[PDB]
Amino acid sequence: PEFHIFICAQNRPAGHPRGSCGAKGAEGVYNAFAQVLIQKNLTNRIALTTTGCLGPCQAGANVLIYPGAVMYSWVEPADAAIIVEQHLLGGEPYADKLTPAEIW
Amino acid sequence: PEFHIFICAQNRPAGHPRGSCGAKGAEGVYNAFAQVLIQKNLTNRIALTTTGCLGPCQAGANVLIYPGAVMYSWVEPADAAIIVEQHLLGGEPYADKLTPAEIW
Ligand code: FES
Ligand code: FES
């Protein structure tokens, strides 16, 4: 792996006070990433893995990338290509969805 | 996080042809790490997270460490402290349980 994409997929019961990335659209986000990776022939260069809780649940859905420990928050399906294209390939973190520096 | 410890926790049904790190003692491995981390006051420095399948199921229980993409295979509870101390604190990957280079 040149890159490792970690998608928080922790579920908690509906109405849990922490919420959960699972309830915030992790499944749609994972699929957007995988669709992008398959499309661009990247599935042998970039690993895509679900995780439990990554810590900042209220900023979900959360995505962490290694190398770098770069986290993204409030992630939506449309960002998957943006992150792959501009950060992973282009070398520039997508500042619009970077987890705030105070939180991570 | 200085280090991120990823513990494959994928379960598959009993008798699944792939097996699962779940069936290979992932939970015993995760608990050993957690106990070493809490005991050495490292839970703010080193993140510990469960993951879906990391790929090489036949070599499980599998742990991956970032920075570095260093995977350990056939992991047992006793290795936790070894990896934390030798590798994560001491800088020397623990040669005895490193995932064969062919595989990862
Ligand atoms: S549930 Fe996703 S970061 Fe906590
Ligand atoms: S189930 Fe753990 S590596 Fe596949």
DSSP calls for chain A: --EEEEEE-----TT-TT--TTTTTHHHHHHHHHHHHHHTT-TTTEEEEEES--S-GGG-S-EEEETTTEEE-S--TTHHHHIIIIIIITS---GGGB--TTT-
Written as six digits, the tokens of A63 are 């995505």
- The answer to whether the CB of B7 falls within 8 A of the CB of B51 is yes
B51 and A51: CB-CB below 8 Å?
yes
Token pair 């810590």 in the structure block, residue? A55
- Residue A90 alpha carbon to ligand 2 centre in Å: 30
Closest chain A residue by Cα to residue B1? A69
CA of A102 to the centre of ligand 2 (A): 33
Give the number of other CB atoms < 10 A from CB of residue A89: 15
Tokens 């770098």 belong to A68
Q: Compute the distance between CA of residue B9 and CA of residue B50 in angstroms, rounded to an integer.
A: 6
**Residue B74 structural domain:** 1-104
C-beta separation of A29 from A76 below 8 A: yes
Q: Minimal Cα–Cα distance from A52 to chain B, Å?
A: 5
If we measure between CA atoms, which residue out of B82, B85, B56 comes closest to residue B69?
A: B56
Tell me the two tokens of residue B44: 């703010």
CATH number where B4 lies: 3.40.30.10
> For chain A, how far is it from start to end, CA to CA, in angstroms?
23
Ligand nearest the Cα of residue A29 is 1
CA distance readout (Å), A55 to A15, B40, B76:
18, 20, 26
| Pocket of ligand 1 contains residue A82 by CB under 6 Å | no
Query: Which element (helix H / strand E) includes B17?
Result: none
Task: Give A43's contacts (C-beta < 8 A, 6+ positions apart).
Answer: A34, A37
Please indicate whether, in this complex, the C-beta atoms of A50 and B52 are within 8 angstroms of each other. yes
Overall number of domains in chain A: 1
Residues of A in contact with B2 (CB under 8 A): none
Q: Which ligand places an atom closest to the C-alpha of A50?
A: 1
3-state secondary structure of A94: coil
